[PDB]
Amino acid sequence: RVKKVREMELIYARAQLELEVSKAQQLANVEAKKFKEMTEALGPGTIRDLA
C-alpha cells in the first residue's frame, strides 16, 4: 500500500513537476521574445544614450 501510493504519486508528480517547467519555459520565451521585439525596435544605441 505505502509502496504503490508513494510510487504512483511519484510518476504523477513527475509528469507534473516537468509540466511545471514547460509552463515556465514557454513564459520565458514570450518574455524574451517581447523583450527582443522592443529592444531592437526602440534602438540598440538609443538605450545607451537614454540611460
Next chain:
Amino acid sequence: AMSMAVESTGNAKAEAESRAEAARIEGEGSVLQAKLKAQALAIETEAELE
C-alpha cells in the same frame, strides 16, 4: 508445609496458566485478524488507487 506449598503453587500457577492460555487466543486471533485486515486494506487501497 507440603500442603502449604502445593496450595500456593497449584492455585497461583493455575491463575497464571489461564491468562497465558487466554493470551494465546489473542496471539492466534491477531494473526488471523491481521491476515484478514491485509485483504481488507488491500482490496480497499488498491481498488481505490484507480
